[PDB]
Structures are given as structure tokens and as C-alpha cells.
Amino acid sequence: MVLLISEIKDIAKKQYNSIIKLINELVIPENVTQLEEDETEKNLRFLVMSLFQIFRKLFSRGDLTLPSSKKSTLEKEQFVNWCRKVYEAFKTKLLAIISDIPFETSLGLDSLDVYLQLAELESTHFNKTFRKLIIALWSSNMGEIEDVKSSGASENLIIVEFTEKYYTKFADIQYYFQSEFNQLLEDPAYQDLLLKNVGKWLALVNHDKHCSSVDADLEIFVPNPPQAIENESKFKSNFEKNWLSLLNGQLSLQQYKSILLILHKRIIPHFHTPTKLMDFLTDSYNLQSSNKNAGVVPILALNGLFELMKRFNLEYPNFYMKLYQIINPDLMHVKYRARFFRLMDVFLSSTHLSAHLVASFIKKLARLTLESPPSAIVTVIPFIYNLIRKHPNCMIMLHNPAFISNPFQTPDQVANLKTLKENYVDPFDVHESDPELTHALDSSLWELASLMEHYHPNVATLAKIFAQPFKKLSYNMEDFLDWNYDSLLNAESS
Amino acid sequence: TGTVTVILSQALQSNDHSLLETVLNNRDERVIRDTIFRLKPALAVILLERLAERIARQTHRQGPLNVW
Amino acid sequence: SLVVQEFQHILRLLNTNVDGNIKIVYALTTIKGVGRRYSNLVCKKADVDLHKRAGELTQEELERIVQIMQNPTHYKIPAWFLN
Amino acid sequence: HDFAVTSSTRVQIFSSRTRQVIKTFSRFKDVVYSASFRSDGKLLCAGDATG
Amino acid sequence: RTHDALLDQVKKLDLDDHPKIVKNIIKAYQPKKEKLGKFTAVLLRHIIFLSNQNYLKNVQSFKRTQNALISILKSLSEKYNRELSEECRDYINEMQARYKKNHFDALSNGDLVFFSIIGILFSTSDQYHLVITPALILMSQFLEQIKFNSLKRIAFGAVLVRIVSQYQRISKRYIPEVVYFFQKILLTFIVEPLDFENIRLDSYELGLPLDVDFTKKRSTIIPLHTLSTMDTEAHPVDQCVSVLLNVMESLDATISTVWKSLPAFNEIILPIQQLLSAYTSKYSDFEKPRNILNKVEKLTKFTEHIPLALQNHKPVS
Amino acid sequence: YSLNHDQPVENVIAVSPTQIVSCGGNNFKVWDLTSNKKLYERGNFNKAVTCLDYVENFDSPMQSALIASSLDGHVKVFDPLDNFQVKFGWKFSGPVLSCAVS
């Protein structure tokens, strides 16, 4: 309507004065955006989007025409007016992206695109602009974004689409992203803003395609790079400073699990101080509380901790003792158990473990097979089988040569076997924490006999292989590892 | 909160000059405070012996070590 | 007191069951279709130690041997040495 | 002037003045466990992984 | 008889009590392949909508209608198994999709009636089947994955364990998920703790005090599933101790049919042993825990409890 | 007779005609068998130890030297003349498994 008329007038066009008036209208569009936060023109924002597109076109025309490169007569006015108009338009776009607590998709996308084009033209005709716009975006927040409890960190509209079409494509912005947040964390008010918007950086960092990821390449936004590939060590320094500040400031439970997962998978190749992350991981693994949701960070904590031992040989005292402590039915019911059991494989693949350790672990996992869901059962049958396979000095715990009887013996030995079978007791204690001290070698697996008396045909077939003689060694745990209820449904239907 | 405490304890239980210099490269005073807070007393005593020793060996190192 | 080290039994390369407790040259000989001197030349062009067993030769070396033996004219093997 | 080192299915006797591979015992099936010399410097024993 | 909505509208325009006779006459006219197969589909869908819809009529006026529909389903199922199995498979797919769309907001007492109809109708003792085994693992996931924080879902799991207890009364197998369900429901009853934190239960708002008479005239099983599981949000103590005695009765029934033959029953029942000993320690009168403790002491003195003979094989020729 | 080393002993070393070495676990205990009791103990190591050897009466200012590798590249030299006190130490990055002296 009126915005479209002003757009047409500015496009047809004292042309500088007319453009300034149009820019004043597009800056009063901030008050219009406040009214949109009240009500987006009967919930539509079509006129607002049209005005934003008009402002973008006008900014493009202004960047093509008026500049501050050459100076002569009235150059101060004729350049500074255009520069201030461009700055005011960029500020209006930033404030529209900033104060919009209301979920305005079209307006937010228009603001993001206008900021993109303005940043490009601003480089080419003037990093500081990025400071201002990341301040606007990190002041943006909504309730659907803040404190994601089920999965994910932040369901922002604006900042997340800013990343999925702006951040993961250009490595030059990526270096000027991390290098500014150090300066932004040196600012106290904006540091407090970051620590309040802690999850926004998690939604920014879960995207796997940072500049340190050498597996793929990224294109370039500005046609002139201001030395964005200066040092990979300085890029990792920016990364690690931002991450140490973030981990020290204002954490929570779901974001703790998320940060620890991304710290296992993506952060360590992008990192530089594994001793700092080592102490952070010792705190994350030794964190023991009565909270039923905070009692399960040891899983990926010990995962990343073992990655850190493999990179550099540190130490964790009573290591397999803490393993025996943490092996819980909560691990049977959480969903990180597949990667935890991969960790359990590279844990128990050592050649210095003994009969007591293996008997304790096989027996505890036998009690968990007595009480565990069946996809977890087809996950953990390989461990019993192949671990009994790699250590055959414990195999007596499946059959006793003195307890098996035969007709070709003396009645004296028959009576001796009868009184010993009456004398037999169960000496295993689940409450002893030392696996070397647990006497799990004398106890067989009637729970594995129950697993032979399971209900599912595939689980019963696996336990019938367990009852059959162990003929082979390679079992392909990766194939027999990741199955679910829905996956078993699809497989049995197929 | 981001200390290096377990690493200080491991190195001062089992002396390695490489771990000593690699953890001594830090200079952040909050890390210094939190480490010596969650540090053992006798381990801190032998650490201060080692600190005087390394200050005397390379006095140029004593700059960031004068605050430790 | 844990020590972590870096083996395989009978295995599958080019659809032939090949033993892992034997020398690698004669393992690539008992690969069907190819023989002694061809096997020796493939291990030479793959730059592996001929005194290794087939439980050795990690998987990137193994796929290098497969790539070289399945593109022979592209790995300095002459047409008169070709079958 | 010589010393034996166990390895993957192989014992390697190195020299001392040269520090080079002098002898390679590789007649084994699996990885050797122990390698010990006699009191008279001629006969060595190699514990294997077959028992 | 050609469409679900059409057949339902016909039965409703008739009369839901006489719709049994109406559908019986329609089936008789049809029998006097395709028509009867579509009739089976629309009739199973209509009885499932009846079980979703109403329970207000008592056992003199609704359950005879429902059993007449069950008997005409028995005739059509003794005549037809192919299209019936196809219909049960499609019901599996649609109910798994409902589970995915809503974890708990898209479950149905009609689906419960469907699982009971399957468990009574089909060959129960089979190992592998196109209907039974997908329905068995569907009941398994239905039990294990629901967020137990209400007596309606508690009773759903209880009658689910009842159906699988018939399943393993005839077929005689074992469910570690039902073991976990017993421990979970007992910890949710006695959360009110120091000795059980390994179960990972959900909510701490329901419990069990010492205010129950638990007499013979006190509430037995008597499960009015569309009445009790829809009216248990108003929560008196007699319904709570009733559903406790129901899950205990299904526990002991499953024991006496299959778990005595289970070789691992001692360590199967050891958490249940500690749980029920805590029950008797806190309440000091409970006759059914006392008798179940007596039965499991008899089973732990009668069971061999010797190391097995898994690596005992004949020498090869 | 027995001598109890609670953590798993991994190497037995007859250093003196009267003394031996329990080389296992994070520490290592040097015993005297003629007195049938541990003469000294040294828990100077980070990881559980894996190797210990001894050399005596050779071209050195220290007559008796005791090398002990503990699975970090870390080999440490003590001396029974100075009651098994730390005298030197080398660190190789890879986890050391064995060590030997000429």
C-alpha cells in the first residue's frame, strides 16, 4: 500500500533526499515492528516484508551510487548522509531481528537477508558490522528457543536459520565469528549476554562443518579475504577460549549432556588444551549426585575421557573399579549404551585382565540380562560370548567337571558328589565393589539358562548358540549392536 | 570449574619435567587460585620446592611464577 | 597394568577364502585366478613386507593391494605380464 | 654385543656396536611371549602364545 | 459391509445391543469371499470402536452382545485366516504409527481388547507367527516404553501382563520386561527408596500407606477397564490396593505356570524377595506376600542351583 | 615362604644375594628375604609399573643401578646403595613395555 507506493517512488527517483525520506520510513518500520510484536498487520507482515525488500533494493542502489571514496564539494554531506542512512537501515534490520520476541518468519528472514547483503556491501564499501549483528541476534530470544529439555539445545528461528544458510558455508565469516567472541567475552555485559544465551552457541556448534574440519571445503562470502586462514592454532585458540568460558559459565543438565556429546565427537579435533578439557572431563565423570537425570553424564564423560587417555596417556585410579560401579540398569535403559558398549569393547580388550575381573563383569551383565529390555539383550549377548572367547581361563563358570556326573565312576565318588552338591552355596556378592574381590568364578549363569528360556526366537537362537560349542571368534558386534524395538519390528516384518 | 588439579597431583606424585613445564605455561590467576585451593598441602610443599628450583634454574620463568 | 596393542583369520578379498596364518605372497597366490609371480609383483607394487603373515597387513594396505590387483594396467604392470 | 627383542611372531636379535637387525627368528605361528638367553650365551628360549 | 463408516452407521441407526443380531443376519445373507472378508474387517473395526466408546451397560446387557460378536468372529476366523492376518498386520502398523505420533495420547482400550481377542483366538503356543510374534513384541514395547505416572497406565500394564501371562501359561516362556515391570510398579508403590535406586521410576506422587483393611470383601480384581482406567484419576486407597493385589496375583500366576520351570528363578525373584520382605517388614500382616515367600523358599530348596552343563557335547565322529 | 604384595606383582627381581623386588602395581616394594620382610618401598610412579632390571659393578660412578619402566615411556633409575632413591629418569612418549641395560 503506502509502503509499496514509497518503494515505487524511491525506485523511480532531490533523489538522495527522497531516498533519505524512504529510509526514514524504513526506520519508522521499527515502530511498525513494535506494532507487529503487538500484531503483524492482522498477523501477516506482508507490507513489512515488502518494505524490507524495498529497503534492501534501495540499499543496493545506494551502494551502487553514493559512496565516500572521493572527496570534493559538499562531499561530507553527500557521503555521510548516505553512510548514516545505510547504518540506520542496518540498525533497523538488526533491531527488527533483535526485539522480535514474536515468531515472525518472513520478517526475520528479511532481516537476516538484508543483514547479509548489507554486510557484503558494507565490507566492499567501508567485522564491526558482525559485532553489531551478533549482538542483535544474541539479544533475540523466544520461549520455544530457551531451555530445550527433550532434545536439542535451542529452537531459535532467526539464529538457527542464520546458521543453516549463513554460517556453515563461508569459512571467512567463521574465523571472524570466533575471533570476535573473544572480544565479546572480554566485554562484561555482552559476556553476561553470552552466558545467558549459552544454548545458542550449542545450536551454532552442533553443525560439524567448522573451518577446522578439513574433510570438506567451504566457499567464500566477500570477494576479498582479510586473512581468514592465518593460523589453525589461533583458530583453535579462539575456539578453546570460547569453549572454556562457556563450560565455566552457566551450564545445565540437558546442555551438559549435549556439550559432552559434541565434546566427544566434534570439539576435540577443534581443540588445543586437552589438559583443561581433561580436568573438565574428570569433573564430568566424577560428578555423582542424587539427581536421576544428572546421574547419567559419566557415560559420555568416560567416553571422552578414554579418547583423552588414548591421545595422551593420563591416569584414572581404580579404573575398572569405577567401571563396575557405573555398570547399571540405567545404562540398560538410556540410549547412549551402543557407543558406551563400543567403549566397553576398547575397554575390556586388554591382555592384562584376569579371571576375577571377567567373572565379575560377565556375572553383573548376566543379572542385567535377567532384567534388561530385549534390544539391549541382543546388544549384549556378543559381549558375553566374545569375552568368554578371548579369556578361556574362566570357561569353567559355564560347566564344572566335578559337578558333571558319569556312570563310569565309583559309588564312593557318587556319594562324595551328592554330599558336595548338598554342600554347594552361592558365594557371589553383588554389593562388593572390587571386581577382583568378587567371587563370581564359583557361580554359574542360571540367568543365561533363563536367556535360553527367553521368549523371542532370535534371542533364544543366540542363547542356543551359547549352549552350543563355541566354534568361532569374529562375531561382528557392530552388526549385532544397534537394534531397537522399531528396528526389530521392521526386521521381523521383513 | 576448569582447574588442572588432578594433573598437578599426578605430576607431583610422579615427577616429569615435561608435564611440569606444560602445565606451568598457564598464567590465568583464577586457574592458579582454584588449583592451589583444590591442591594437597604436602604436594603443594614439594611443588613450592620445585618452583624455587625452577625459578633458580631459569630466572626468566619467574615472571608468571611470581604470582603463583 | 593395562597394555593396548594394535590380527585376522581366514578372510575375503575378491570373493576367495584366504588364510591368515600364511605368507602374504602365497596367500595372494591362493587367491583364485592369480599365481606366484603375479602375487609377488602385486605385493611389490603395494610396497609391503613379503615376510608378513596375512593376519598382519592392516586394512588400508589390503585395499591398496585390491586396488592395484584389480587395476593392473594402471599400476605399471606390463601387458605381457598380464594374463 | 647382542640382545634379543620379542615381536609379532618374531624374535629380533640386534647388535650393540651397530644397533642393527642381526637375526630374525620367524618360524613361529603366533606372537612370542618370552625371550631369554642361557648362562653360556648360545641357547635362547622363546615362550610363545601356543603354550 | 463394504465400508467401515457405512457399517458403523448402519449398526448405530439400528441399535448397538441388537447390532449383534443385525450383523449376524448380514453375515448369514452373505454366506448364503470378498464380501465376508470386508465384513470381518468392518466388524472388527466396529467392535473395537464399541470398546473405545461405551462400557455403561452391565454384564447383563453389553457383554453378551460383545461375546456374540466374539463368537461370530470365531466362526469367521475358523473359516478365514488370510484376510484376518492381513487386518491384524495393518492394525499393528497403524497402532505403531499412533505410538510414534503420541507416546501415550494415542493408545486405546480397544487395542487392549484387540490384543486379548488375538490371544484367545489365534494359536497361542506358536513360536513364530505372522500375527502373534509382531503382536508379542508390540505388547513388549507397549509395556516397556510408556511413562508410568498414572494408575490408568498402571492398570493398562497390569492387564497387558495378564494377557502375556495367558500367552506364557500356554506357551510357557519368560519376560524380563515383565520382571522389570513388577519391580517398577512395586517401587512406584513404595517410593513414599534407600535400597532401590536402580529401577529408574518416573514420578513420586503416588504411594502406599498403612490404612488398608485388604479384607475378603475388599476390592478384588473385577476389572472394569473402560470404567476403572477412565475414573481412576479420582484416587481412593481401595482401588490402589486392588490393582496392587491384581499385579501380585498375575505375578504369582506367572510364577506357578512358567517361572518354577525357569532355572534362574532365585535371582529372578531376589529383588522381588527383598521388595516383599520390605513389604512385610513395614506392614506386618500381608498374607499373600507371606505365601509367595513360602512358595519361593520351597522353590529355592527344590531347585538344583548347580552349575550347568552348557559345554557338554559328544565327541565328533 | 610367601611375601604379600596386594596389588598384582608383575616382575620378581633378585637384586642382592639377600634382597628381591616386587615390581607390580603403581609402586614397587624391595624386600629382604633373609629377614623375610620389605626393606624399602617406592611408590614414585604414575602408571602401574611394567619393567624393572638391575645392573652392578660396571663402569659408572654409581655402582648399582635399578631401572624401572612404568608404561608412559617413563623409565626411572634408583640405586640400592642409596636405599632405592631416585637418581635419574627418562620419558619416551609411547607407553614403555620393556627395558634393558647392557
Curated annotation (Swiss-Prot), chain A:
Organism annotation: Saccharomyces cerevisiae (strain ATCC 204508 / S288c) (Baker's yeast)
Other noteworthy facts: Present with 1630 molecules/cell in log phase SD medium.
Oligomeric form and interacting partners: Interacts with NOP14 and MPP10. Interacts with snoRNA U3. Component of the ribosomal small subunit (SSU) processome composed of at least 40 protein subunits and snoRNA U3.
Family label: Belongs to the CBF/MAK21 family.
GO terms (BP aspect): endonucleolytic cleavage in 5'-ETS of tricistronic rRNA transcript (SSU-rRNA, 5.8S rRNA, LSU-rRNA); endonucleolytic cleavage in ITS1 to separate SSU-rRNA from 5.8S rRNA and LSU-rRNA from tricistronic rRNA transcript (SSU-rRNA, 5.8S rRNA, LSU-rRNA); endonucleolytic cleavage to generate mature 5'-end of SSU-rRNA from (SSU-rRNA, 5.8S rRNA, LSU-rRNA); maturation of SSU-rRNA; ribosomal small subunit assembly; ribosomal small subunit biogenesis; rRNA processing
Free-text function comment from the UniProt entry: Involved in nucleolar processing of pre-18S ribosomal RNA and ribosome assembly. Has a role in the nuclear export of 40S pre-ribosomal subunit to the cytoplasm. Its subcellular location and association with pre-40S subunit are unaffected by RPS19 disruptions, suggesting it acts before the ribosomal protein.
Keyword terms, alphabetized: Nucleus, Ribonucleoprotein, Ribosome biogenesis, rRNA processing
InterPro entries (UniProt xref): CCAAT-binding_factor, Noc4
Protein name per Swiss-Prot or TrEMBL: Nucleolar complex protein 4
Pfam families: CBF
Localization: Nucleus, Nucleolus
From Swiss-Prot, chain B:
Intervals holding WD repeats: 38-68
Ranges in a coiled coil: none
Domain of life: Eukaryota
Residue stretches spanning the membrane: none
Localization of this protein: Nucleus, Nucleolus
Further information: Present with 33100 molecules/cell in log phase SD medium.
Functional summary from the UniProt entry: Involved in nucleolar processing of pre-18S ribosomal RNA. Required for optimal pre-ribosomal RNA transcription by RNA polymerase I together with a subset of U3 proteins required for transcription (t-UTPs).
Quaternary structure annotation from Swiss-Prot or TrEMBL: Interacts with snoRNA U3. Interacts with MPP10. Component of the ribosomal small subunit (SSU) processome composed of at least 40 protein subunits and snoRNA U3. In the absence of snoRNA3, forms a complex with other t-UTPs. This complex can associate with pre-18S ribosomal RNAs.
Family the UniProt entry places it in: Belongs to the UTP5 family.
Protein name in the entry: U3 small nucleolar RNA-associated protein 5
Annotated source species: Saccharomyces cerevisiae (strain ATCC 204508 / S288c) (Baker's yeast)
From Swiss-Prot, chain C:
Superkingdom as given in the UniProt entry: Eukaryota
Range of the intact protein held here: 2 to 87 of 146
Role description: Component of the ribosome, a large ribonucleoprotein complex responsible for the synthesis of proteins in the cell. The small ribosomal subunit (SSU) binds messenger RNAs (mRNAs) and translates the encoded message by selecting cognate aminoacyl-transfer RNA (tRNA) molecules. The large subunit (LSU) contains the ribosomal catalytic site termed the peptidyl transferase center (PTC), which catalyzes the formation of peptide bonds, thereby polymerizing the amino acids delivered by tRNAs into a polypeptide chain.
Compartments in which it is found: Cytoplasm
Entry protein name: Small ribosomal subunit protein uS13A
Keyword Acyltransferase among record annotations: no
Signal peptide from the UniProt entry: none
Cross-link Glycyl lysine isopeptide (Lys-Gly) (interchain with G-Cter in ubiquitin), sequence positions: K32, K45, K76
Cellular-component GO terms for this entry: cytoplasm; cytosol; cytosolic small ribosomal subunit; mitochondrion; small ribosomal subunit
Keywords for the protein's UniProt record, in alphabetical order: Acetylation, Cytoplasm, Isopeptide bond, Methylation, Ribonucleoprotein, Ribosomal protein, RNA-binding, rRNA-binding, Ubl conjugation
Modified residues (N6-methyllysine): K44
Protein family according to the UniProt entry: Belongs to the universal ribosomal protein uS13 family.
Keyword rRNA-binding (UniProt): yes
N-acetylserine: modified positions: S1
One example GO MF annotation: rRNA binding
Post-translational modification: N-terminally acetylated by acetyltransferase NatA.
Other observations noted: Present with 48100 molecules/cell in log phase SD medium. There are 2 genes for uS13 in yeast.
Curated annotation (Swiss-Prot), chain E:
Encoding gene (name): NOP14
Gene source species: Saccharomyces cerevisiae (strain ATCC 204508 / S288c)
Protein name in UniProt: Nucleolar complex protein 14
Shown part of the complete sequence: 382 to 709 of 810
Binding partners and assembly: Interacts with snoRNA U3. Interacts with EMG1, MPP10 and NOC4. Component of the ribosomal small subunit (SSU) processome composed of at least 40 protein subunits and snoRNA U3.
Subcellular location: Nucleus, Nucleolus
Signal peptide as annotated in the record: none
Family the entry assigns: Belongs to the NOP14 family.
Function: Involved in nucleolar processing of pre-18S ribosomal RNA. Has a role in the nuclear export of 40S pre-ribosomal subunit to the cytoplasm.
